[PDB]
Structures are given as structure tokens and as C-alpha cells.
Amino acid sequence: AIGEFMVSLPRMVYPQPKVLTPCRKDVLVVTPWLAPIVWEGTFNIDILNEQFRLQNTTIGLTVFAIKKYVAFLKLFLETAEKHFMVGHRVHYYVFTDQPAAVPRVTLGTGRQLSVLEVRAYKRWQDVSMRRMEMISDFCERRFLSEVDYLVCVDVDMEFRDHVGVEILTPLFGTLHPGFYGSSREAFTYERRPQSQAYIPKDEGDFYYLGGFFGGSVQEVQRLTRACHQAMMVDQANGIEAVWHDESHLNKYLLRHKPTKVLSPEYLWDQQLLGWPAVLRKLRFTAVP
Amino acid sequence: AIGEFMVSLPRMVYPQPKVLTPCRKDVLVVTPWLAPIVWEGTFNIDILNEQFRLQNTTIGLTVFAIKKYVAFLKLFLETAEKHFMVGHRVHYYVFTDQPAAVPRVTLGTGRQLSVLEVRAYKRWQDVSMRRMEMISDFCERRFLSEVDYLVCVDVDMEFRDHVGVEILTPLFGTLHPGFYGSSREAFTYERRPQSQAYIPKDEGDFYYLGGFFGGSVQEVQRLTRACHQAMMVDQANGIEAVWHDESHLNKYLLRHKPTKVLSPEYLWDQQLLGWPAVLRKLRFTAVP
Ligand SMILES: O=c1ccn([C@@H]2O[C@H](COP(=O)(O)OP(=O)(O)O)[C@@H](O)[C@H]2O)c(=O)[nH]1
Numbered sequence: 043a044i045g046e047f048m049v050s051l052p053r054m055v056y057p058q059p060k061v062l063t064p065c066r067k068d069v070l071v072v073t074p075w076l077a078p079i080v081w082e083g084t085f086n087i088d089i090l091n092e093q094f095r096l097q098n099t100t101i102g103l104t105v106f107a108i109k110k111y112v113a114f115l116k117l118f119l120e121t122a123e124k125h126f127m128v129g130h131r132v133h134y135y136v137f138t139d140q141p142a143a144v145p146r147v148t149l150g151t152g153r154q155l156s157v158l159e160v161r162a163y164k165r166w167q168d169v170s171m172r173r174m175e176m177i178s179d180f181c182e183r184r185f186l187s188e189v190d191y192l193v194c195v196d197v198d199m200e201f202r203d204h205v206g207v208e209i210l211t212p213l214f215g216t217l218h219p220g221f222y223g224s225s226r227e228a229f230t231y232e233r234r235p236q237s238q239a240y241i242p243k244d245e246g247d248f249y250y251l252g253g254f255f256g257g258s259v260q261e262v263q264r265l266t267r268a269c270h271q272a273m274m275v276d277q278a279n280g281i282e283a284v285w286h287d288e289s290h291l292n293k294y295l296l297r298h299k300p301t302k303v304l305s306p307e308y309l310w311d312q313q314l315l316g317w318p319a320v321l322r323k324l325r326f327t328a329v330p
Numbered sequence: 331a332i333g334e335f336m337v338s339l340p341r342m343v344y345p346q347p348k349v350l351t352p353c354r355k356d357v358l359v360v361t362p363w364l365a366p367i368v369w370e371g372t373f374n375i376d377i378l379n380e381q382f383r384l385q386n387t388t389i390g391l392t393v394f395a396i397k398k399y400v401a402f403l404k405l406f407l408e409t410a411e412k413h414f415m416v417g418h419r420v421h422y423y424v425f426t427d428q429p430a431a432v433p434r435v436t437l438g439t440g441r442q443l444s445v446l447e448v449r450a451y452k453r454w455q456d457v458s459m460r461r462m463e464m465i466s467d468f469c470e471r472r473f474l475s476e477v478d479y480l481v482c483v484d485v486d487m488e489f490r491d492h493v494g495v496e497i498l499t500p501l502f503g504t505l506h507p508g509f510y511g512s513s514r515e516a517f518t519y520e521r522r523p524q525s526q527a528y529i530p531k532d533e534g535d536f537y538y539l540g541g542f543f544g545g546s547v548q549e550v551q552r553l554t555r556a557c558h559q560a561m562m563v564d565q566a567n568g569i570e571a572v573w574h575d576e577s578h579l580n581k582y583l584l585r586h587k588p589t590k591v592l593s594p595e596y597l598w599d600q601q602l603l604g605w606p607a608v609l610r611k612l613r614f615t616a617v618p
Pocket residue numbers: 105106107108109110111166169170195196197198253
């Protein structure tokens with residue numbers, strides 16, 4: 043459930059937060075619109091686990107595995123079992139053009155997997171883009187009835203460390219690991235005014251990933267509907283944004299501020315970017 | 331409105347938040363349950379004003395002025411006009427045993443004041459305590475129909491600087507200015523197990539003020555109902571908590587974590603505590 047009467051927390055013994063001691067002094071931990079930026083050291087997971095378990099929270103995780111990308115599902119799902127929302131109710135939704143190629147992965151108690159067959163698209167860009175349509179179509183359908191939050195991620199990834207209820211909020215995006223230290227003029231936003239995804243050089247907060255976003259079912263339905271509609275306008279006008287649905291997601295999150303932002307801990311590429319000191323954990327990472 | 335469809339923000343030009351530059355390195359700006367702690371430098375008020383104006387947010391401000399405390403209303407209200415939620419819709423609710431002693435204060439456009447007559451209590455403790463009952467009785471009544479958020483404050487105070495929509499959230503408390511640097515064993519929580527307000531020496535996050543709390547109408551109704559019920563139990567058992575409704579508020583906020591915490595900028599006593607470097611603004615202050 044979300045927004046329902048909240049029962050009292052039980053007594054808990056944990057370290058006192060000290061007002062004159064920051065958790066992290068090396069990084070921005072709150073956005074200028076007062077959304078937490080989620081880094082290791084900023085959250086007590088025992089408190090958060092209590093809060094979300096008392097609400098019997100169910101998290102849906104969507105992943106697309108179209109054409110050759112079905113090869114990524116075994117590691118994705120097996121590592122999700124080790125690291126993603128462990129202890130909470132989880133519903134995996136695997137969208138694929140090859141239901142028979144979905145590996146048989148053993149799940150923990152309270153976790154389920156549904157295979158949703160979709161059409162395969164010829165262009166990888168179109169495959170990547172059509173996720174917005176498909177997610178919004180399934181929101182109306184089963185997601186509103188089955189889960190409280192949706193987490194929407196790329197499949198060519200593995201979980202290496204904890205990804206849990208600290209991410210959950212009405213609307214979240216994730217800082218792209220290539221751009222978290224960049225100035226906004228360097229962000230690869232869509233820069234052509236002819237596209238609905240257009241962001242001028244003097245606007246922008248962050249560069250968010252197409253590969254890891256989420257929120258409440260309602261807010262995810264809103265985001266994916268808006269991005270799908272904006273993509274349809276661009277298509278009608280004969281323009282395709284530079285980074286496809288990621289460009290539209292960035293436009294959306296500029297105009298509709300997320301209520302949490304996830305640090306690049308939550309989507310990293312160690313081969314391309316190593317392991318910087320500012321990253322205390324690499325939680326979800328690109329497969330080589 | 332709260333929770334209603336949110337329109338897009340317009341284009342805005344403002345400084346880019348930089349991930350590798352904290353806003354404040356001298357203070358904790360987020361709690362371990364991922365609630366912002368509101369300090370100067372943590373928020374862009376232009377972004378927040380946009381967000382809340384697009385929702386046509388109405389803020390109710392409750393204040394009790396019983397017996398001699400009616401003398402405090404003129405400065406309280408006149409300074410509120412200069413500093414509290416300017417630009418937003420505001421409804422003041424003045425609870426008093428002397429309606430004729432309420433000063434005639436000129437209000438800005440979009441702001442209104444209602445005088446609510448109540449009984450006067452003999453003991454200042456009882457006057458202070460009975461606010462919980464009265465606020466919960468008025469929630470059911472007019473507050474649900476008239477405002478989106480409630481802010482509940484002491485009257486023996488003046489606004490000196492901006493107090494605005496940065497505070498608004500489902501549930502907030504304010505760090506008591508005497509204890510923000512203290513360890514929890516030193517907090518003046520109720521320590522007798524015989525009281526419903528009891529907090530053991532190894533529990534507690536912060537010491538919050540009875541004099542400045544708020545949230546959505548629903549969450550404020552919940553808090554004030556719970557504190558009133560707990561006070562009635564204590565009375566039936568012949569015990570009165572050490573700091574009266576403040577002790578109960580602390581118990582409530584321990585077991586029901588606030589979604590923002592306000593720094594001591596938001597309730598300070600300059601005569602008793604001076605003007606420390608960590609306080610960049612003194613926003614709402616005790617009258618000598
Ligand atoms: O042929 C494809 C191309 C893309 N995808 C899905 O679309 C996501 C985004 O594409 P990709 O990971 O190739 O993009 P990048 O990580 O380079 O942004 C992939 O993770 C898959 O989930 C897919 O299933 N099959």
C-alpha cells in the first residue's frame with residue numbers, strides 16, 4: 043500500500059544522527075527542491091525497511107529483453123535475487139519477444155515473475171524507445187492492481203550490492219555515471235528546438251539515465267505517457283532525439299522534479315569509469 | 331490542493347546544482363530516513379514557490395493567545411505578514427478566550443484571519459496542553475475544507491526572516507534550539523516509564539519543539555489526536571509529562587518519522603542563545 047494509515051515504528055536501537063556532523067561532506071545529498079540524493083552513508087536501512095514493511099510495500103521491476111538481449115536475463119535476475127528489495131514483495135515483469143528464452147530462475151519467498159510477450163522492433167533505438175509505450179500500457183493494466191512502486195531498468199546489467207527501499211518515492215531518476223561531475227552545457231540533452239525533448243544550454247539540473255527510473259505507479263504512468271506522447275510528436279515532425287527515450291526522460295524530469303535522485307552508485311560502468319573514491323558502493327553495474 | 335495532477339514547471343534560469351559541491355558541509359541536511367533538514371543554502375525558493383503556487387497551495391497557521399498572551403498577537407501577525415508564506419494563500423486561525431483583544435491587523439491579498447473562541451484554562455501547562463485537543467477538533471471541522479497544510483506555532487514569537495513553502499511536507503517538526511548539538515541522553519524527553527510519552531535513554535533522533543510543527547491537514551490531525559489521547563491516558567494515571575504536549579509530540583515523532591525537519595533557524599531565542607555561525611538566518615524568534 044501507499045499513503046495508508048501508518049502504524050507506529052517499534053523501539054529501535056541505532057546511532058543518534060548528529061546535527062553538527064554531516065553523513066557525507068564530499069557530495070551534494072539534497073537537491074535545491076529538497077529531494078534527497080541517495081548515497082551510501084545517508085540512510086539507515088533498518089529504519090527504512092521498517093517503514094516500508096509496515097506498509098506491506100510491493101515493488102514491481104520492469105525489464106525489456108528483446109532479440110539478443112535475452113542472454114542478459116539470467117545474471118540480471120539471479121543477482122536481483124541477491125540484492126534487490128530483499129525482504130520485500132517483488133514482482134518482476136520481463137517484456138520479451140522470446141518467452142521460451144527466459145531462464146528458469148529460482149526466486150525467494152514473496153517474489154514472482156511474469157513474462158509479457160511483446161513485438162520486436164528492428165532498430166535498437168526503436169526497441170529502447172517503445173519501452174515508454176509498453177510501460178504506460180501495462181500501468182493501466184496490471185501495475186495499478188499489483189504493485190505500489192515501479193522500478194524500470196536496463197537488462198544488460200547486474201546487481202553487485204544492496205538496492206533497496208531507500209530508492210522508493212513518488213518519482214525518481216538516477217544520475218548518469220558519465221556526467222555527474224559535468225556542467226550542464228556539457229550534458230547531452232537534446233539541443234534542437236524542433237524536438238519536444240529540447241533543453242537550452244542554460245537549463246537543466248542533472249543528466250538522468252534512461253536505464254534506471256521509477257516511482258509510484260501513478261507517477262511512472264505519468265512519466266511514460268508524457269514521454270511516449272512527446273516521442274510521437276517528434277516522429278510526426280521527422281526528428282528523433284539524440285538519446286531517444288533518455289532525452290525525453292530528461293525533459294520530463296526537468297519540468298517535473300523527482301522526489302529522490304539516485305547517485306551513480308545505482309548505475310555504474312566500472313570498465314569505462316573505474317571505481318572513484320566518491321563511490322563507496324557499486325550497486326548495479328553494466329555488463330562488459 | 332495536495333497530490334493533484336501537477337502541471338509542468340516553466341523554463342527557469344538558476345544556478346546548476348553541482349553534485350561534487352555540497353550546499354552545506356557544516357551541518358546534517360538529511361535525516362537517516364531521508365527527510366530533508368531545512369537550512370539556509372539547501373533550497374532554491376524560486377523552484378519551490380513555483381511548485382507550490384502551481385498547486386494553489388493554502389497554508390493554515392494556528393496560534394493560541396489565551397489570557398495575557400493576547401498581547402503578543404500584534405507583533406506576531408504583523409511580522410507574519412512580512413515573512414510567512416508571502417505570495418501564497420494563508421488562513422490564520424487565532425484561538426483565544428478574548429476575541430475583542432485580537433488586534434486589527436492589515437493583511438495582504440489572498441490572506442484571511444478567523445478568530446476562534448475557546449475556554450481559558452487556569453494552568454499554563456493545561457493551556458499549552460489543550461492545544462492538541464483544540465487543533466484536532468478544528469481539523470475535522472474547518473481545516474480539511476479550508477487549507478492544504480497546517481502550521482502550528484507559539485504566539486510569544488516574531489518573524490524576522492523568510493518562512494515559506496520550503497517547510498511544507500506531510501509531517502514536520504523543528505529542532506529545539508537548546509538541544510540541536512546535544513547527545514540524546516541529554517534530551518529532556520519524558521523518562522518515567524509510567525507515562526505514555528516515555529522515551530528510554532538509548533532512543534531518540536532529535537529533540538523537537540512543541541512550538542512549531544505542522545504538515546498536511548491529515549497528518550496534523552493524526553499527530554494532535556494521538557498526542558491528545560496519550561495525554562488523556564497520562565491524566566487518568568495521575569502523571570503529567572515533564573514538558574507537557576512537547577513530550578508527547580517527541581514520542582509521536584520518534585515513532586512516526588517526520589518527512590522534513592526544520593533547523594533551529596525556524597525557532598530561535600537570540601537572548602538566551604545568541605547568533606551562532608551555523609545559523610545563517612534567524613527566521614522566527616522568541617520575544618523577550
Ligand atoms: O536489441 C535490444 C536493444 C535494447 N534492448 C533493451 O533496451 C535497453 C536499452 O538499450 P541499451 O542497454 O543497448 O542502451 P545503452 O545502455 O547503451 O543506453 C536494453 O538494456 C534492453 O533492456 C533490448 O532488449 N534489445
